[PDB]
Amino acid sequence: KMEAKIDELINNDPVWSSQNESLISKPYNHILLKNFRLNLIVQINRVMNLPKDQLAIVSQIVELLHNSSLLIDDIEDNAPLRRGQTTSHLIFGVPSTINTANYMYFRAMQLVSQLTTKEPLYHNLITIFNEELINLHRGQGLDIYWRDFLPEIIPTQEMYLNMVMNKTGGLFRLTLRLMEALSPSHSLVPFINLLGIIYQIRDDYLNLKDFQMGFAEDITEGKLSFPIVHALNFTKTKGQTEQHNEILRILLLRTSDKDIKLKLIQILEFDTNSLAYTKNFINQLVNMIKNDNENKYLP
Amino acid sequence: NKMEAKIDELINNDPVWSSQNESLISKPYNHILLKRLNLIVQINRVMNLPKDQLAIVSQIVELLHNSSLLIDDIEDNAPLRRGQTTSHLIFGVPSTINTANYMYFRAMQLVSQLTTKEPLYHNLITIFNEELINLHRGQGLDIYWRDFLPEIIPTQEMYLNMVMNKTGGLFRLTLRLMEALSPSGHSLVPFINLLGIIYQIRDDYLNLKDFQMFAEDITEGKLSFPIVHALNFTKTKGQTEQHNEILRILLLRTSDKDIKLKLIQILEFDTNSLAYTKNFINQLVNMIKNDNENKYLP
Numbered sequence: 265k266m267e268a269k270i271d272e273l274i275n276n277d278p279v280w281s282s283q284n285e286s287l288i289s290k291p292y293n294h295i296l297l298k299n300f301r302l303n304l305i306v307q308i309n310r311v312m313n314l315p316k317d318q319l320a321i322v323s324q325i326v327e328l329l330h331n332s333s334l335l336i337d338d339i340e341d342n343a344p345l346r347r348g349q350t351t352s353h354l355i356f357g358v359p360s361t362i363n364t365a366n367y368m369y370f371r372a373m374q375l376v377s378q379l380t381t382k383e384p385l386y387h388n389l390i391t392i393f394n395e396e397l398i399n400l401h402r403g404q405g406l407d408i409y410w411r412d413f414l415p416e417i418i419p420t421q422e423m424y425l426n427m428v429m430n431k432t433g434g435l436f437r438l439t440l441r442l443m444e445a446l447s448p449s450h451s452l453v454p455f456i457n458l459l460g461i462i463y464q465i466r467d468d469y470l471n472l473k474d475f476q477m478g479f480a481e482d483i484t485e486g487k488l489s490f491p492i493v494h495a496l497n498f499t500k501t502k503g504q505t506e507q508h509n510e511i512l513r514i515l516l517l518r519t520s521d522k523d524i525k526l527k528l529i530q531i532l533e534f535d536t537n538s539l540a541y542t543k544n545f546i547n548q549l550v551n552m553i554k555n556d557n558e559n560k561y562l563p
Numbered sequence: 564n565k566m567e568a569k570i571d572e573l574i575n576n577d578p579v580w581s582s583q584n585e586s587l588i589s590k591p592y593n594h595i596l597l598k599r600l601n602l603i604v605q606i607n608r609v610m611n612l613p614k615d616q617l618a619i620v621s622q623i624v625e626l627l628h629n630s631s632l633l634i635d636d637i638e639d640n641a642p643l644r645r646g647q648t649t650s651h652l653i654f655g656v657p658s659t660i661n662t663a664n665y666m667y668f669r670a671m672q673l674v675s676q677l678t679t680k681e682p683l684y685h686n687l688i689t690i691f692n693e694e695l696i697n698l699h700r701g702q703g704l705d706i707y708w709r710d711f712l713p714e715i716i717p718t719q720e721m722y723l724n725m726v727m728n729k730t731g732g733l734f735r736l737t738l739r740l741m742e743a744l745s746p747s748g749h750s751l752v753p754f755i756n757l758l759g760i761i762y763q764i765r766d767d768y769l770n771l772k773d774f775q776m777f778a779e780d781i782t783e784g785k786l787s788f789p790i791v792h793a794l795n796f797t798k799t800k801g802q803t804e805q806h807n808e809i810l811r812i813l814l815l816r817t818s819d820k821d822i823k824l825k826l827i828q829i830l831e832f833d834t835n836s837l838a839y840t841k842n843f844i845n846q847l848v849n850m851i852k853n854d855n856e857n858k859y860l861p
């Protein structure tokens with residue numbers, strides 16, 4: 265009867281129930297308790313005009329990738345909070361959270377084959393998906409390397425921006441490239457690239473500016489953020505050796521101490537003027553769009 | 564206007580990625596490489612893929628397998644892998660997670676180097692997508708049972724389905740790709756499933772028996788084949804104290820050798836879970852070694 269049971273098992277597809285599906289989803293469902301990623305999709309479809317069926321799936325794909333990457337990013341950044349709530353790995357544990365997020369990457373991958381049945385086009389959608397997830401990992405990998413090997417390598421603004429094109433551009437380009445390929449209707453990748461860059465620097469700027477006015481978690485993480493990259497390279501360039509070292513020392517403290525975090529912010533405001541330099545950099549990037557009268561980037 | 568020219572050129576180019584950056588983030592992966600091909604070769608005696616293709620099927624499987632191990636070691640808190648320190652303890656959990664995941668997608672990339680045939684590619688990618696979804700499901704269950712014990716005490720049946728997913732995942736992936744690429748009998752899938760099952764129960768068994776004679780599965784808290792049998796056997800025979808002591812030890816996440824040895828001797832003399840397992844393994848191997856009407860074997 266034992267041999268019968270095995271015979272049966274090995275001849276069937278692996279058993280997986282609905283209840284099992286729920287167990288594995290808990291870490292992902294928790295972050296869902298968190299519509300502007302979709303506002304941009306909706307808006308771009310005015311150009312692309314994908315039928316609502318196809319569009320919804322693109323939206324589901326983007327949602328799984330976005331959410332999953334955030335679940336793993338918080339494990340990678342040791343973040344206690346996300347969207348004001350406790351992060352999933354602190355509730356379900358790092359193990360289940362890593363596994364559930366990765367599981368969702370593959371669920372997203374599965375949705376990609378339900379956008380089309382056209383074999384040339386299907387290949388294309390997969391290549392896009394594959395190429396941008398590879399790019400998201402390269403950027404994430406470099407962002408983490410610099411942070412965990414600090415002070416071995418201090419990136420420059422250029423190195424930083426190439427990291428951003430990969431890390432933050434990945435999902436923006438993946439979304440748009442999928443829509444342009446599905447479109448039955450100039451490419452907007454340059455503009456989505458510009459948008460993702462503005463997006464990452466704003467995220468890095470706001471993380472510091474909300475605290476000065478915000479937990480300033482980036483400091484606790486030791487992150488080579490945009491204002492930090494500028495402050496470090498500014499002090500190196502002006503010989504401000506002790507400030508250079510003081511910034512490194514605070515980054516390396518992986519501190520949650522309110523006071524010390526404040527000391528580093530005051531270094532960036534009074535000494536290097538990095539926060540004002542970032543606010544300005546952003547504005548410039550936006551102006552590029554606000555003053556695109558020929559519509560070279562804009563549709 | 565020079566910065567704008569710089570920004571303009573940036574956004575109009577593919578993202579920049581140097582071979583240097585490629586090495587810096589390959590560290591956790593390069594490390595586990597310092598420590599399969601045979602099963603792929605024997606199986607090919609039947610599928611006859613040309614050597615150019617077989618080598619790619621092989622790089623794919625290596626990438627997926629080593630990546631699975633990197634992640635597995637983080638999820639299981641393993642200090643050792645193949646006699647050496649685990650990558651996460653050297654480079655940190657963050658880099659190891661990201662690199663391991665990076666390699667899953669590199670492996671996916673390679674799939675398109677297997678054929679130009681659009682219909683076939685679509686099937687290769689589906690097989691790849693299905694078995695990785697399966698691996699994750701299995702791993703999900705193994706990890707949930709362990710980390711929330713005793714919310715769920717799995718039965719032998721549940722363990723086996725978890726294994727069909729978890730371990731059968733890569734075995735089936737390897738085999739389904741080959742069957743799909745073959746230029747030349749019945750599917751060898753059931754055989755490959757039985758092999759994944761023997762491989763896992765054997766792994767669980769050897770982890771304890773080699774210590775009895777570091778029993779890291781005890782430290783980890785894994786609902787291993789021997790442990791599932793003991794937990795169910797104890798409840799069934801009404802050995803309340805033993806059932807609870809097994810759980811208590813598992814929940815300690817202990818590295819105390821005497822404590823691990825106590826658990827092992829409990830499965831040895833009190834529940835006869837070790838003998839049950841050894842014999843279950845023998846029976847399974849017997850299913851193949853006595854397959855005279857080649858219902859499993861080719």
Ligand SMILES: CCCCCCCCCCOc1ccc[n+](CC(P(=O)(O)O)P(=O)(O)O)c1
Pocket residue numbers: 300301304305326330333334337341404431432435436439467
């Ligand atoms: C048009 C599609 C929009 C999709 C939703 C927005 C996608 C933003 C993608 C950002 O990608 C990453 C990559 C790596 C890490 N993160 C998380 C950041 P945070 O914790 O500050 O929110 P990070 O830790 O990189 O600062 C995000």
Ligand SMILES: CCCCCCCCCCOc1ccc[n+](CC(P(=O)(O)O)P(=O)(O)O)c1
Pocket residue numbers: 599602603624628631632635639702729730733734737738762766
């Ligand atoms: C033709 C196939 C070539 C590859 C064969 C791979 C065989 C082993 C597959 C095991 O798959 C998994 C899945 C999940 C976790 N593990 C790691 C095991 P261990 O740490 O004991 O080595 P597990 O943690 O599941 O006991 C392994």
Ligand SMILES: C=C(C)CCOP(=O)(O)OP(=O)(O)O
Pocket residue numbers: 334347464467
């Ligand atoms: C993780 C980064 C860098 C931004 C992702 O999008 P947003 O952070 O702005 O939106 P939600 O996290 O609230 O989904």
Ligand SMILES: [Mg+2]
Pocket residue numbers: 337338341343
């Ligand atoms: Mg983060």
Ligand SMILES: [Mg+2]
Pocket residue numbers: 337340341407
């Ligand atoms: Mg991050």
Ligand SMILES: [Mg+2]
Pocket residue numbers: 635636639641
């Ligand atoms: Mg393990």
Ligand SMILES: [Mg+2]
Pocket residue numbers: 635638639705
């Ligand atoms: Mg495991």
